Amino acid sequence: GLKAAQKTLFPLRSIDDVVRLFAAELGREEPDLVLLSLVLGFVEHFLAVNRVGLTYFPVADLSIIAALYARFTAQIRGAVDLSLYPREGGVSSRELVKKVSDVIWNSLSRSYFKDRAHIQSLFSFITGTKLDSSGVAFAVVGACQALGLRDVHLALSEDHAWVVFGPNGEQTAEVTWHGKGNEDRRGQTVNAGVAERSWLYLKGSYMRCDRKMEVAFMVCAINPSIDLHTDSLELLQLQQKLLWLLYDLGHLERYPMALGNLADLEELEPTPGRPDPLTLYHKGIASAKTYYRDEHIYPYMYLAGYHCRNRNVREALQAWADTATVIQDYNYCREDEEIYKEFFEVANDVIPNLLKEAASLLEAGSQGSALQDPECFAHLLRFYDGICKWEEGSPTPVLHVGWATFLVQSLGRFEGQVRQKVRIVSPVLTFQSEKMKGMKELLVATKINSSAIKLQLTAQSQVQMKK
């Protein structure tokens, strides 16, 4: 269904040929999402799923790509009769969006693991009848473009995908599942989730893609992983070059996660002349502040991760405190479990390991240690304060005694003479949470009162009956 101009670069014989195709499509009125996703899925299949026979690059012949494209357009156009859904005022209806969602969803294999790698693209949809959750949302948007539905666009939070459409692009519709429960809300708006103030819907500060950002999404969706221990260098290079192409064209401006992904790729293999990973992480944060009311968690997570890998305890703690400062204005809701998992791992695994190594290095005479810096102690306190404030008023609790043991351990990594230098005001630190306000006196004792800290963090009111 391809136009003559779209076919002239074939066959694609290299990474750079694929980049040329993306550049050409991004210069058109709209880039062809179906074509681009099929090309990426094809090359990812032969670079990560099955490398048998690979000698340089899996050549993408026009005949092969056109035949996959024809399979997709035949399925969609055969199943969705537009005459049954008149486009009132040139915009799509909720029934039409639901129909496209049903067509994709009903095509999927009846039994398969949704967490598998390499089931994100239209190549997977056509050849394997398998898609992951956000892959279904992308496929619905690609199908809508194939049908001429210019108003249907991908919407993305930090943990979920759906579509926007209709008059002024103001309607939302679920088109895929979220997480592991049986029931979906396909066809419904996201308004209840926005109103709930869950992290899942970002209080409404989610991404609303244009077609160029949908290209950025499929590029971020490339998965270079061959196995647990090995990535495809070819796919890493492809994803990195495509992200720079998008960056230069302005299409990552409103896409914090893509900037974090690009920073991570630059850390692995820097491109000469380009901004450093730190600069890119900060651009991601600036994007979230500018376009999303500073209501995204991952821009700070990406930054903290980089600092953590470099064993920069001070800056990792600062960035995690900043994540907690964002989460504190959310309600912890059912379906937000991924972000709970992430905070749990930072508080109860990653921070303890960092501080354990810091303590060993301090014993060996390190200077300027985070453990001797009252500002670092304040970051740790601010991290816990945001988590406690997140919990306030939430329908689901967050803290339990399993968190309290690591809090006591982490507090103890800082000597009392360091801890005493932080002034808690009603370094200077202000607590937002009632749990941390009640904790304030306990925070400066030479020997931390473990039992009292545990009671205060868990809001347990009693100790054991018997001696």
Side-chain angles (χ1 to χ4, degrees), residues 1-109 111-446 448-465 467:
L2 290 162
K3 310 281 186 179
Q6 304 183 270
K7 301 173 177 185
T8 66
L9 288 166
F10 290 85
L12 311 177
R13 301 189 175 277
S14 67
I15 289 161
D16 287 345
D17 283 354
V18 179
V19 179
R20 277 186 278 277
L21 175 67
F22 273 75
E25 286 293 318
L26 286 161
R28 293 171 64 83
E29 178 175 337
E30 296 192 359
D32 187 326
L33 299 178
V34 173
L35 176 61
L36 294 174
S37 179
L38 288 167
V39 166
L40 290 182
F42 173 91
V43 306
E44 177 164 324
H45 178 85
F46 289 109
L47 286 166
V49 179
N50 186 349
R51 297 172 60 93
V52 158
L54 174 77
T55 58
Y56 175 66
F57 187 86
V59 175
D61 296 295
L62 179 64
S63 57
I64 295 297
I65 298 301
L68 292 158
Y69 191 99
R71 289 193 71 180
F72 188 77
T73 58
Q75 206 202 142
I76 301 306
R77 289 172 196 159
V80 185
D81 179 355
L82 292 175
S83 79
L84 305 177
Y85 307 91
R87 273 73 68 218
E88 294 292 321
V91 314
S92 300
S93 64
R94 187 167 292 278
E95 297 86 354
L96 175 54
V97 173
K98 180 60 160 55
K99 177 60 178 178
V100 178
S101 176
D102 288 349
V103 168
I104 300 301
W105 191 99
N106 288 339
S107 300
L108 302 176
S109 291
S111 184
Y112 70 97
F113 289 95
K114 305 304 184 302
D115 58 339
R116 193 72 41 165
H118 317 296
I119 59 166
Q120 76 285 53
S121 69
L122 295 184
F123 183 90
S124 181
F125 179 69
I126 293 296
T127 63
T129 61
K130 284 171 261 148
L131 284 174
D132 58 23
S133 168
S134 61
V136 169
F138 177 83
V140 166
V141 176
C144 287
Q145 178 186 52
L147 288 163
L149 309 180
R150 302 194 71 177
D151 62 314
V152 180
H153 287 291
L154 189 63
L156 298 168
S157 68
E158 292 185 312
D159 200 47
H160 186 44
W162 61 96
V163 306
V164 293
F165 70 96
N168 312 130
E170 71 202 0
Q171 290 306 313
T172 60
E174 296 280 3
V175 295
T176 191
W177 66 92
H178 176 253
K180 290 163 86 204
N182 200 71
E183 185 186 22
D184 65 48
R185 288 193 295 277
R186 293 188 305 112
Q188 296 175 224
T189 73
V190 303
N191 291 323
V194 171
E196 261 211 303
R197 310 175 57 83
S198 63
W199 169 72
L200 183 59
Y201 298 100
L202 299 172
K203 289 176 280 171
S205 300
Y206 53 84
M207 297 180 63
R208 296 160 164 270
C209 295
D210 63 13
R211 289 275 179 263
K212 316 289 186 181
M213 293 164 68
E214 292 150 2
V215 177
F217 174 84
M218 79 173 84
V219 172
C220 286
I222 295 165
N223 190 340
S225 79
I226 291 162
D227 62 33
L228 256 197
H229 321 117
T230 315
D231 290 333
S232 161
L233 296 174
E234 307 94 340
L235 292 169
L236 289 164
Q237 184 186 131
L238 179 58
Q239 183 178 52
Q240 195 163 8
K241 284 176 168 173
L242 290 174
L243 285 173
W244 282 118
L245 172 67
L246 289 154
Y247 179 99
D248 285 342
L249 292 169
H251 303 316
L252 305 188
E253 176 72 12
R254 308 185 178 216
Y255 201 160
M257 286 185 291
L259 294 160
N261 196 161
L262 181 56
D264 284 357
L265 289 164
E266 285 295 306
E267 175 187 4
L268 183 58
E269 192 68 68
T271 305
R274 291 297 192 167
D276 288 315
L278 268 175
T279 299
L280 291 163
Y281 297 120
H282 283 280
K283 284 181 181 293
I285 290 160
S287 176
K289 290 174 175 288
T290 295
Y291 295 106
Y292 304 108
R293 304 194 308 188
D294 205 8
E295 289 180 324
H296 289 193
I297 303 295
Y298 288 161
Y300 301 102
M301 278 297 186
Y302 271 111
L303 178 58
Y306 176 79
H307 285 309
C308 183
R309 290 188 293 278
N310 291 317
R311 315 307 276 167
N312 190 335
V313 180
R314 176 176 290 100
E315 298 303 330
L317 290 171
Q318 186 158 242
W320 284 315
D322 288 343
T323 65
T325 289
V326 180
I327 205 68
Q328 76 182 328
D329 293 315
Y330 282 93
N331 291 336
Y332 180 47
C333 298
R334 192 187 73 264
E335 299 204 70
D336 289 347
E337 297 78 22
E338 174 58 31
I339 208 66
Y340 174 89
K341 188 170 169 298
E342 293 188 29
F343 277 110
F344 189 100
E345 173 80 356
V346 172
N348 303 317
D349 184 6
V350 182
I351 288 172
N353 291 336
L354 277 169
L355 303 183
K356 177 185 178 194
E357 175 178 23
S360 291
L361 292 170
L362 188 62
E363 277 315 285
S366 73
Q367 301 311 314
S369 177
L371 299 183
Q372 291 188 324
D373 185 351
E375 292 287 355
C376 291
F377 185 61
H379 301 328
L380 181 68
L381 297 180
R382 183 158 60 92
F383 170 76
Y384 278 92
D385 185 54
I387 295 165
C388 292
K389 177 66 174 179
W390 180 30
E391 178 177 68
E392 294 188 12
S394 297
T396 323
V398 172
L399 293 153
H400 58 69
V401 74
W403 293 72
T405 283
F406 292 106
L407 171 61
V408 169
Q409 185 187 66
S410 293
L411 292 172
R413 292 291 189 198
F414 296 82
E415 248 191 292
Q417 297 166 8
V418 179
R419 296 186 274 103
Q420 292 187 352
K421 298 190 179 73
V422 179
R423 179 163 180 81
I424 296 157
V425 301
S426 307
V428 161
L429 181 60
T430 299
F431 285 143
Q432 296 299 316
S433 76
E434 295 303 318
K435 277 184 180 180
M436 297 300 288
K437 290 173 191 186
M439 199 87 74
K440 77 169 149 293
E441 295 82 3
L442 301 169
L443 299 167
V444 306
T446 300
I448 302 283
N449 185 338
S450 180
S451 295
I453 296 288
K454 292 179 184 168
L455 295 171
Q456 183 61 15
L457 191 68
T458 61
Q460 177 173 325
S461 75
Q462 296 162 300
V463 287
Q464 69 173 44
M465 296 178 277
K467 293 201 186 203

